[PDB]
Amino acid sequence: DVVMTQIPLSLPVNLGDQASISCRSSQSLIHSNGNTYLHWYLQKPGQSPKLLMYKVSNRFYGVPDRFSGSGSGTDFTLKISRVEAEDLGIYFCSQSSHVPPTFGGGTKLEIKRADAAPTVSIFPPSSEQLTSGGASVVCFLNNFYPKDINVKWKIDGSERQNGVLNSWTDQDSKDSTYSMSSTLTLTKDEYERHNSYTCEATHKTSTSPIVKSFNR
Amino acid sequence: QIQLVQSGPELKKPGETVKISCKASGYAFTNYGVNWVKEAPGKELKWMGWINIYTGEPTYVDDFKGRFAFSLETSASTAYLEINNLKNEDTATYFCTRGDYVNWYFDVWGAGTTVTVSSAKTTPPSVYPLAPGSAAQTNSMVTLGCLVKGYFPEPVTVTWNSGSLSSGVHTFPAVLQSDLYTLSSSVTVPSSPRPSETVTCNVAHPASSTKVDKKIVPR
Numbered sequence: 001d002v003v004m005t006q007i008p009l010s011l012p013v014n015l016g017d018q019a020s021i022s023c024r025s026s027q028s029l030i031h032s033n034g035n036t037y038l039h040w041y042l043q044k045p046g047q048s049p050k051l052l053m054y055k056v057s058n059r060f061y062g063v064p065d066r067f068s069g070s071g072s073g074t075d076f077t078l079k080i081s082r083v084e085a086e087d088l089g090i091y092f093c094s095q096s097s098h099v100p101p102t103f104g105g106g107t108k109l110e111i112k113r114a115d116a117a118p119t120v121s122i123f124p125p126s127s128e129q130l131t132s133g134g135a136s137v138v139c140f141l142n143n144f145y146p147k148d149i150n151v152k153w154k155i156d157g158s159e160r161q162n163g164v165l166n167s168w169t170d171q172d173s174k175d176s177t178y179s180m181s182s183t184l185t186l187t188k189d190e191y192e193r194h195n196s197y198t199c200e201a202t203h204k205t206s207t208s209p210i211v212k213s214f215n216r
Numbered sequence: 217q218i219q220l221v222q223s224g225p226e227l228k229k230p231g232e233t234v235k236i237s238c239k240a241s242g243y244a245f246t247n248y249g250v251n252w253v254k255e256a257p258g259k260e261l262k263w264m265g266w267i268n269i270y271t272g273e274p275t276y277v278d279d280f281k282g283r284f285a286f287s288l289e290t291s292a293s294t295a296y297l298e299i300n301n302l303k304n305e306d307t308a309t310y311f312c313t314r315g316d317y318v319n320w321y322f323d324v325w326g327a328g329t330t331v332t333v334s335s336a337k338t339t340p341p342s343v344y345p346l347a348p349g350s351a352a353q354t355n356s357m358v359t360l361g362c363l364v365k366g367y368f369p370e371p372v373t374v375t376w377n378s379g380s381l382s383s384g385v386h387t388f389p390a391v392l393q394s395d396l397y398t399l400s401s402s403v404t405v406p407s408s409p410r411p412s413e414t415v416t417c418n419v420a421h422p423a424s425s426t427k428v429d430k431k432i433v434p435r
Protein backbone atom coordinates (compact mmCIF):
# COMPACT_ATOMS: atom_id res chain seq x y z
CA ASP A 1 0.00 0.00 0.00
CA VAL A 2 1.52 3.56 -0.55
CA VAL A 3 1.82 5.64 2.59
CA MET A 4 0.49 9.27 2.47
CA THR A 5 1.67 11.53 5.32
CA GLN A 6 0.52 14.98 6.49
CA ILE A 7 2.00 17.80 8.59
CA PRO A 8 0.73 19.50 10.80
CA LEU A 9 -2.15 17.65 12.63
CA SER A 10 -3.86 20.86 13.87
CA LEU A 11 -3.13 24.05 11.95
CA PRO A 12 -4.00 27.07 14.06
CA VAL A 13 -4.96 29.90 11.84
CA ASN A 14 -6.07 33.47 12.14
CA LEU A 15 -9.21 33.73 9.95
CA GLY A 16 -8.43 36.18 7.12
CA ASP A 17 -4.79 34.94 7.11
CA GLN A 18 -2.71 32.96 4.60
CA ALA A 19 -2.78 29.19 5.38
CA SER A 20 -0.73 26.32 3.74
CA ILE A 21 -1.28 22.57 4.18
CA SER A 22 1.43 20.20 3.00
CA CYS A 23 1.16 16.53 2.08
CA ARG A 24 3.83 13.97 0.99
CA SER A 25 4.00 10.45 -0.35
CA SER A 26 5.87 7.18 -0.14
CA GLN A 27 6.27 6.17 -3.89
CA SER A 28 5.76 8.66 -6.77
CA LEU A 29 2.51 9.79 -8.22
CA ILE A 30 3.65 10.67 -11.80
CA HIS A 31 2.07 7.87 -13.89
CA SER A 32 2.86 5.68 -16.96
CA ASN A 33 0.55 8.14 -18.80
CA GLY A 34 2.51 11.19 -17.64
CA ASN A 35 -0.18 12.10 -15.08
CA THR A 36 -0.38 12.80 -11.35
CA TYR A 37 -3.47 11.70 -9.48
CA LEU A 38 -3.21 13.78 -6.32
CA HIS A 39 -6.52 14.99 -4.96
CA TRP A 40 -7.51 16.77 -1.73
CA TYR A 41 -10.79 16.23 0.31
CA LEU A 42 -12.21 18.54 3.16
CA GLN A 43 -14.36 16.91 5.94
CA LYS A 44 -16.35 19.50 7.81
CA PRO A 45 -17.75 18.45 11.29
CA GLY A 46 -19.62 15.20 11.54
CA GLN A 47 -20.09 15.04 7.73
CA SER A 48 -18.80 13.62 4.39
CA PRO A 49 -15.63 14.44 2.28
CA LYS A 50 -16.14 16.75 -0.75
CA LEU A 51 -13.38 16.70 -3.50
CA LEU A 52 -11.64 20.13 -3.47
CA MET A 53 -8.69 19.76 -5.88
CA TYR A 54 -7.67 17.23 -8.53
CA LYS A 55 -4.53 16.32 -10.36
CA VAL A 56 -2.43 18.52 -8.18
CA SER A 57 -3.65 21.86 -9.29
CA ASN A 58 -7.14 21.89 -10.74
CA ARG A 59 -9.97 22.75 -8.42
CA PHE A 60 -13.34 21.06 -8.39
CA TYR A 61 -16.35 23.31 -9.23
CA GLY A 62 -17.99 25.67 -6.88
CA VAL A 63 -14.66 25.77 -5.09
CA PRO A 64 -13.26 29.33 -5.07
CA ASP A 65 -10.26 31.41 -5.96
CA ARG A 66 -9.01 30.91 -2.43
CA PHE A 67 -7.72 27.35 -3.04
CA SER A 68 -4.63 26.24 -4.85
CA GLY A 69 -2.17 23.48 -5.00
CA SER A 70 1.16 22.26 -6.39
CA GLY A 71 4.10 19.94 -6.40
CA SER A 72 5.52 16.73 -7.74
CA GLY A 73 6.15 13.11 -7.24
CA THR A 74 6.74 12.86 -3.57
CA ASP A 75 5.78 16.26 -2.21
CA PHE A 76 2.63 18.51 -2.62
CA THR A 77 1.17 21.54 -0.75
CA LEU A 78 -2.38 23.14 -0.69
CA LYS A 79 -2.90 26.87 0.18
CA ILE A 80 -5.99 28.87 1.14
CA SER A 81 -5.47 32.67 0.52
CA ARG A 82 -7.77 34.41 3.00
CA VAL A 83 -8.86 31.45 5.26
CA GLU A 84 -12.53 31.97 6.22
CA ALA A 85 -15.36 30.84 8.63
CA GLU A 86 -16.40 28.34 5.93
CA ASP A 87 -13.02 26.50 5.42
CA LEU A 88 -12.19 24.93 8.68
CA GLY A 89 -12.36 21.09 8.90
CA ILE A 90 -10.01 18.13 8.56
CA TYR A 91 -8.20 18.25 5.11
CA PHE A 92 -7.25 14.87 3.50
CA CYS A 93 -4.81 14.31 0.55
CA SER A 94 -5.09 11.05 -1.35
CA GLN A 95 -3.51 9.60 -4.43
CA SER A 96 -5.19 7.61 -7.22
CA SER A 97 -1.94 7.03 -9.19
CA HIS A 98 -1.71 3.60 -7.51
CA VAL A 99 -3.56 0.61 -6.07
CA PRO A 100 -4.75 0.67 -3.51
CA PRO A 101 -5.67 4.47 -3.60
CA THR A 102 -4.53 5.58 -0.24
CA PHE A 103 -5.81 8.23 1.91
CA GLY A 104 -3.74 10.64 3.88
CA GLY A 105 -4.35 11.39 7.55
CA GLY A 106 -5.49 15.01 7.44
CA THR A 107 -4.77 18.28 9.22
CA LYS A 108 -7.73 20.18 10.98
CA LEU A 109 -7.75 23.96 10.27
CA GLU A 110 -8.44 25.07 13.87
CA ILE A 111 -8.36 28.59 15.27
CA LYS A 112 -5.39 30.10 17.07
CA ARG A 113 -5.97 32.31 20.06
CA ALA A 114 -3.97 33.95 22.81
CA ASP A 115 -3.35 31.13 25.31
CA ALA A 116 -5.03 29.91 28.46
CA ALA A 117 -4.02 27.49 31.15
CA PRO A 118 -6.72 25.04 32.36
CA THR A 119 -9.20 25.93 35.17
CA VAL A 120 -9.17 22.57 37.19
CA SER A 121 -11.72 21.01 39.71
CA ILE A 122 -11.29 17.79 41.69
CA PHE A 123 -14.65 16.30 42.76
CA PRO A 124 -14.84 13.50 45.40
CA PRO A 125 -17.02 10.31 44.81
CA SER A 126 -20.61 10.44 45.79
CA SER A 127 -23.19 8.83 48.21
CA GLU A 128 -24.74 6.61 45.56
CA GLN A 129 -21.51 5.80 43.72
CA LEU A 130 -20.24 4.51 47.09
CA THR A 131 -23.54 2.81 47.99
CA SER A 132 -23.10 0.77 44.70
CA GLY A 133 -19.51 -0.09 45.32
CA GLY A 134 -17.08 1.71 43.04
CA ALA A 135 -16.14 5.32 43.29
CA SER A 136 -15.06 7.34 40.22
CA VAL A 137 -12.95 10.45 40.95
CA VAL A 138 -13.20 13.25 38.32
CA CYS A 139 -10.84 16.18 37.45
CA PHE A 140 -12.31 18.64 34.86
CA LEU A 141 -9.32 20.53 33.22
CA ASN A 142 -11.25 23.35 31.42
CA ASN A 143 -11.38 26.30 29.04
CA PHE A 144 -7.66 26.11 28.04
CA TYR A 145 -5.46 26.68 24.99
CA PRO A 146 -3.75 24.82 23.45
CA LYS A 147 -4.89 21.26 23.01
CA ASP A 148 -1.86 19.41 24.52
CA ILE A 149 -2.06 19.08 28.37
CA ASN A 150 -1.84 15.90 30.49
CA VAL A 151 -2.98 14.56 33.77
CA LYS A 152 -1.05 12.70 36.32
CA TRP A 153 -3.28 11.10 39.01
CA LYS A 154 -1.07 11.03 42.11
CA ILE A 155 -2.83 8.74 44.62
CA ASP A 156 -0.97 9.00 47.86
CA GLY A 157 2.23 10.09 46.25
CA SER A 158 2.74 7.04 44.00
CA GLU A 159 0.97 7.53 40.75
CA ARG A 160 -1.63 5.52 38.82
CA GLN A 161 -2.85 4.34 35.39
CA ASN A 162 -5.65 1.56 35.83
CA GLY A 163 -9.02 3.39 35.59
CA VAL A 164 -7.87 6.78 34.21
CA LEU A 165 -10.04 7.16 31.11
CA ASN A 166 -9.54 10.61 29.60
CA SER A 167 -11.84 12.43 27.15
CA TRP A 168 -11.60 15.72 25.34
CA THR A 169 -13.82 18.34 23.56
CA ASP A 170 -13.50 19.97 20.18
CA GLN A 171 -12.67 23.63 19.82
CA ASP A 172 -15.31 25.62 21.76
CA SER A 173 -16.94 27.59 18.90
CA LYS A 174 -17.81 30.31 21.32
CA ASP A 175 -14.31 31.09 22.74
CA SER A 176 -11.85 28.74 21.02
CA THR A 177 -10.43 27.30 24.26
CA TYR A 178 -10.58 23.52 24.86
CA SER A 179 -11.80 21.38 27.82
CA MET A 180 -10.93 17.91 28.94
CA SER A 181 -11.66 15.67 32.00
CA SER A 182 -10.30 12.43 33.42
CA THR A 183 -12.31 9.89 35.42
CA LEU A 184 -10.13 7.67 37.66
CA THR A 185 -12.10 4.65 38.88
CA LEU A 186 -11.36 2.75 41.97
CA THR A 187 -13.63 0.17 43.68
CA LYS A 188 -15.42 1.56 46.79
CA ASP A 189 -12.65 0.30 48.87
CA GLU A 190 -9.55 0.59 46.67
CA TYR A 191 -11.12 3.98 47.22
CA GLU A 192 -11.65 3.62 51.04
CA ARG A 193 -8.02 2.73 51.70
CA HIS A 194 -6.00 5.93 50.89
CA ASN A 195 -5.83 9.58 51.83
CA SER A 196 -4.87 12.28 49.20
CA TYR A 197 -6.01 12.00 45.63
CA THR A 198 -4.56 14.43 43.18
CA CYS A 199 -4.81 14.85 39.51
CA GLU A 200 -1.86 16.92 38.37
CA ALA A 201 -2.22 18.84 35.06
CA THR A 202 0.93 19.80 32.98
CA HIS A 203 0.42 22.43 30.36
CA LYS A 204 2.64 24.99 28.82
CA THR A 205 1.22 28.01 30.53
CA SER A 206 2.75 27.21 33.96
CA THR A 207 6.30 25.88 34.24
CA SER A 208 5.07 24.50 37.52
CA PRO A 209 2.34 21.84 37.58
CA ILE A 210 -1.35 22.74 38.33
CA VAL A 211 -2.51 20.30 40.80
CA LYS A 212 -5.97 20.23 42.53
CA SER A 213 -6.62 17.73 45.25
CA PHE A 214 -8.71 16.55 48.23
CA ASN A 215 -7.94 14.16 51.19
CA ARG A 216 -10.17 11.18 51.55
CA GLN B 217 -29.98 16.46 -6.65
CA ILE B 218 -27.48 13.99 -8.18
CA GLN B 219 -26.61 11.96 -5.15
CA LEU B 220 -25.74 8.56 -3.76
CA VAL B 221 -28.18 7.98 -0.86
CA GLN B 222 -27.36 5.31 1.79
CA SER B 223 -29.15 3.52 4.55
CA GLY B 224 -29.66 3.75 8.30
CA PRO B 225 -27.24 3.38 11.19
CA GLU B 226 -27.42 -0.12 12.67
CA LEU B 227 -26.35 -2.09 15.76
CA LYS B 228 -25.15 -5.67 15.46
CA LYS B 229 -23.90 -8.22 17.99
CA PRO B 230 -20.74 -10.01 16.49
CA GLY B 231 -21.18 -13.08 14.25
CA GLU B 232 -23.89 -11.34 12.27
CA THR B 233 -24.72 -10.12 8.73
CA VAL B 234 -25.35 -6.48 7.89
CA LYS B 235 -26.14 -5.28 4.40
CA ILE B 236 -25.60 -1.65 3.29
CA SER B 237 -27.38 -0.29 0.30
CA CYS B 238 -26.35 2.80 -1.70
CA LYS B 239 -28.72 4.29 -4.27
CA ALA B 240 -27.74 6.40 -7.19
CA SER B 241 -30.31 8.76 -8.62
CA GLY B 242 -29.78 11.62 -11.00
CA TYR B 243 -26.73 10.10 -12.78
CA ALA B 244 -25.98 7.44 -15.38
CA PHE B 245 -24.94 4.75 -12.92
CA THR B 246 -23.22 2.52 -15.48
CA ASN B 247 -20.86 5.42 -16.28
CA TYR B 248 -18.94 5.71 -12.92
CA GLY B 249 -17.99 3.05 -10.35
CA VAL B 250 -19.17 2.87 -6.76
CA ASN B 251 -16.09 2.61 -4.49
CA TRP B 252 -16.65 1.83 -0.77
CA VAL B 253 -14.43 3.88 1.75
CA LYS B 254 -14.23 3.09 5.54
CA GLU B 255 -13.84 5.48 8.49
CA ALA B 256 -12.75 3.68 11.62
CA PRO B 257 -12.52 5.57 15.03
CA GLY B 258 -9.52 7.70 14.39
CA LYS B 259 -7.88 5.20 12.09
CA GLU B 260 -7.48 5.52 8.37
CA LEU B 261 -10.11 6.64 5.96
CA LYS B 262 -9.10 3.36 4.18
CA TRP B 263 -10.34 2.13 0.77
CA MET B 264 -12.22 -1.13 0.57
CA GLY B 265 -13.11 -2.29 -2.93
CA TRP B 266 -14.95 -0.90 -6.06
CA ILE B 267 -17.80 -2.23 -8.13
CA ASN B 268 -17.69 -1.44 -11.80
CA ILE B 269 -21.11 -1.42 -13.22
CA TYR B 270 -20.34 -1.97 -16.95
CA THR B 271 -19.41 -5.49 -15.85
CA GLY B 272 -20.66 -6.07 -12.29
CA GLU B 273 -17.26 -7.39 -11.14
CA PRO B 274 -15.74 -6.22 -7.86
CA THR B 275 -12.21 -5.40 -6.90
CA TYR B 276 -11.03 -5.75 -3.47
CA VAL B 277 -8.11 -4.52 -1.70
CA ASP B 278 -6.81 -7.71 -0.08
CA ASP B 279 -7.99 -6.96 3.48
CA PHE B 280 -11.69 -7.15 3.29
CA LYS B 281 -11.64 -9.62 0.35
CA GLY B 282 -14.29 -12.23 0.38
CA ARG B 283 -15.70 -11.71 3.98
CA PHE B 284 -16.88 -8.38 2.61
CA ALA B 285 -19.28 -8.79 -0.42
CA PHE B 286 -20.24 -6.05 -2.89
CA SER B 287 -23.25 -6.56 -5.17
CA LEU B 288 -25.49 -4.67 -7.56
CA GLU B 289 -29.04 -4.35 -8.92
CA THR B 290 -28.49 -1.89 -11.85
CA SER B 291 -32.21 -1.56 -12.89
CA ALA B 292 -32.59 -0.24 -9.38
CA SER B 293 -29.34 1.67 -9.40
CA THR B 294 -28.46 0.38 -5.91
CA ALA B 295 -25.01 -0.92 -4.65
CA TYR B 296 -24.39 -3.36 -1.73
CA LEU B 297 -21.92 -4.25 1.00
CA GLU B 298 -22.56 -7.20 3.24
CA ILE B 299 -20.44 -7.90 6.21
CA ASN B 300 -20.92 -11.41 7.56
CA ASN B 301 -19.91 -12.53 11.05
CA LEU B 302 -18.86 -9.04 11.95
CA LYS B 303 -16.04 -8.73 14.35
CA ASN B 304 -16.10 -5.87 16.99
CA GLU B 305 -13.50 -4.11 15.00
CA ASP B 306 -16.09 -3.85 12.19
CA THR B 307 -17.39 -0.68 13.76
CA ALA B 308 -16.85 2.31 11.62
CA THR B 309 -18.85 4.44 9.22
CA TYR B 310 -18.99 3.14 5.62
CA PHE B 311 -19.28 5.54 2.63
CA CYS B 312 -19.81 4.89 -1.02
CA THR B 313 -18.21 7.11 -3.69
CA ARG B 314 -19.01 7.77 -7.30
CA GLY B 315 -15.59 7.17 -8.78
CA ASP B 316 -14.54 8.49 -12.11
CA TYR B 317 -12.65 6.75 -15.02
CA VAL B 318 -11.15 9.94 -16.52
CA ASN B 319 -9.29 11.90 -13.80
CA TRP B 320 -9.71 9.17 -11.16
CA TYR B 321 -11.20 11.03 -8.22
CA PHE B 322 -14.22 10.50 -5.94
CA ASP B 323 -16.68 13.30 -6.38
CA VAL B 324 -20.10 12.40 -4.91
CA TRP B 325 -19.99 10.59 -1.49
CA GLY B 326 -23.04 9.59 0.55
CA ALA B 327 -23.67 10.44 4.23
CA GLY B 328 -22.36 7.21 5.68
CA THR B 329 -23.83 4.30 7.51
CA THR B 330 -22.43 3.71 10.99
CA VAL B 331 -22.24 0.11 12.04
CA THR B 332 -21.82 -0.46 15.78
CA VAL B 333 -20.86 -3.97 16.64
CA SER B 334 -21.29 -4.75 20.30
CA SER B 335 -22.43 -7.49 22.47
CA ALA B 336 -24.09 -5.20 24.96
CA LYS B 337 -27.69 -5.06 25.96
CA THR B 338 -29.34 -1.74 26.65
CA THR B 339 -28.94 -0.49 30.18
CA PRO B 340 -30.34 2.91 31.43
CA PRO B 341 -27.54 5.12 32.97
CA SER B 342 -26.63 5.93 36.51
CA VAL B 343 -26.61 9.75 36.71
CA TYR B 344 -24.37 10.66 39.70
CA PRO B 345 -24.05 14.24 41.04
CA LEU B 346 -20.58 15.81 41.28
CA ALA B 347 -20.46 18.68 43.88
CA PRO B 348 -17.16 20.24 44.98
CA GLY B 349 -14.76 19.03 47.76
CA SER B 350 -15.27 22.42 49.40
CA ALA B 351 -12.95 24.51 47.53
CA ALA B 352 -13.76 28.15 48.33
CA GLN B 353 -14.12 31.20 46.19
CA THR B 354 -11.80 29.51 43.70
CA ASN B 355 -12.19 33.01 42.28
CA SER B 356 -15.86 33.76 41.53
CA MET B 357 -17.24 30.80 39.70
CA VAL B 358 -18.27 27.36 40.94
CA THR B 359 -18.03 24.23 38.78
CA LEU B 360 -20.10 21.16 39.31
CA GLY B 361 -21.07 18.35 36.92
CA CYS B 362 -22.85 14.96 36.50
CA LEU B 363 -21.28 11.57 35.75
CA VAL B 364 -23.88 9.75 33.84
CA LYS B 365 -22.28 6.33 33.80
CA GLY B 366 -22.76 2.90 32.41
CA TYR B 367 -25.20 3.12 29.58
CA PHE B 368 -25.76 1.36 26.34
CA PRO B 369 -26.47 2.58 23.67
CA GLU B 370 -25.47 6.01 22.67
CA PRO B 371 -26.95 8.61 22.70
CA VAL B 372 -27.85 10.44 25.81
CA THR B 373 -28.66 14.09 25.95
CA VAL B 374 -27.51 16.08 29.05
CA THR B 375 -28.79 19.55 29.90
CA TRP B 376 -29.08 21.57 33.25
CA ASN B 377 -32.06 23.58 34.56
CA SER B 378 -34.07 22.15 31.62
CA GLY B 379 -31.94 23.96 29.06
CA SER B 380 -31.55 27.29 30.87
CA LEU B 381 -27.86 26.88 31.54
CA SER B 382 -25.90 26.60 28.21
CA SER B 383 -22.86 29.05 28.23
CA GLY B 384 -20.61 27.25 30.66
CA VAL B 385 -21.73 23.65 30.00
CA HIS B 386 -19.22 21.32 28.44
CA THR B 387 -20.39 17.79 27.93
CA PHE B 388 -17.31 15.63 27.07
CA PRO B 389 -17.50 12.60 24.70
CA ALA B 390 -18.58 9.18 25.62
CA VAL B 391 -15.85 6.60 26.17
CA LEU B 392 -16.00 2.83 26.95
CA GLN B 393 -15.25 1.27 30.35
CA SER B 394 -15.90 -2.29 29.28
CA ASP B 395 -18.80 -2.77 26.73
CA LEU B 396 -20.89 0.12 28.15
CA TYR B 397 -20.28 3.88 27.89
CA THR B 398 -19.45 6.56 30.58
CA LEU B 399 -20.24 10.31 29.93
CA SER B 400 -19.96 13.52 32.04
CA SER B 401 -20.89 17.21 31.80
CA SER B 402 -19.71 20.47 33.65
CA VAL B 403 -21.57 23.74 34.33
CA THR B 404 -19.78 26.70 35.69
CA VAL B 405 -22.08 29.14 37.45
CA PRO B 406 -21.45 32.41 39.37
CA SER B 407 -20.71 31.82 43.03
CA SER B 408 -23.84 33.71 44.25
CA PRO B 409 -26.14 31.35 42.22
CA ARG B 410 -25.03 27.95 43.54
CA PRO B 411 -26.19 27.03 46.39
CA SER B 412 -28.54 30.10 46.56
CA GLU B 413 -30.38 29.01 43.40
CA THR B 414 -30.75 25.41 42.29
CA VAL B 415 -28.70 23.69 39.55
CA THR B 416 -30.06 20.27 38.23
CA CYS B 417 -28.45 18.10 35.43
CA ASN B 418 -31.28 16.59 33.36
CA VAL B 419 -30.25 13.45 31.38
CA ALA B 420 -32.50 11.42 29.04
CA HIS B 421 -31.25 8.17 27.39
CA PRO B 422 -33.84 7.54 24.66
CA ALA B 423 -32.99 3.90 23.78
CA SER B 424 -34.29 2.92 27.20
CA SER B 425 -36.88 5.63 27.78
CA THR B 426 -35.44 7.07 30.93
CA LYS B 427 -34.92 10.67 32.09
CA VAL B 428 -33.06 11.28 35.39
CA ASP B 429 -33.01 14.77 37.01
CA LYS B 430 -30.27 15.15 39.54
CA LYS B 431 -30.25 18.36 41.68
CA ILE B 432 -26.62 19.34 42.60
CA VAL B 433 -26.75 19.65 46.33
CA PRO B 434 -23.94 20.94 48.57
CA ARG B 435 -20.97 19.37 49.83
Ligand SMILES: CC(=O)[C@H]1CC[C@H]2[C@@H]3CCC4=CC(=O)CC[C@]4(C)[C@H]3CC[C@]12C
Binds near residue numbers: 101
Ligand atom coordinates in the same frame (compact mmCIF):
# COMPACT_ATOMS: atom_id res chain seq x y z
C1 LIG C 1 -14.09 4.35 -12.22
C2 LIG C 1 -13.53 4.54 -10.86
O1 LIG C 1 -14.30 4.50 -9.93
C3 LIG C 1 -12.11 4.91 -10.68
C4 LIG C 1 -11.87 5.77 -9.45
C5 LIG C 1 -10.48 5.42 -8.95
C6 LIG C 1 -9.82 4.51 -10.00
C7 LIG C 1 -8.67 3.49 -9.88
C8 LIG C 1 -7.51 4.16 -9.24
C9 LIG C 1 -6.34 3.30 -9.10
C10 LIG C 1 -5.96 2.77 -10.46
C11 LIG C 1 -4.66 2.87 -10.99
C12 LIG C 1 -4.38 2.35 -12.21
O2 LIG C 1 -3.41 2.78 -12.87
C13 LIG C 1 -5.26 1.19 -12.67
C14 LIG C 1 -6.68 1.70 -12.57
C15 LIG C 1 -7.11 2.06 -11.15
C16 LIG C 1 -7.39 0.75 -10.44
C17 LIG C 1 -8.29 3.00 -11.27
C18 LIG C 1 -9.42 2.32 -11.95
C19 LIG C 1 -10.59 3.21 -11.96
C20 LIG C 1 -11.03 3.85 -10.58
C21 LIG C 1 -11.50 2.78 -9.59
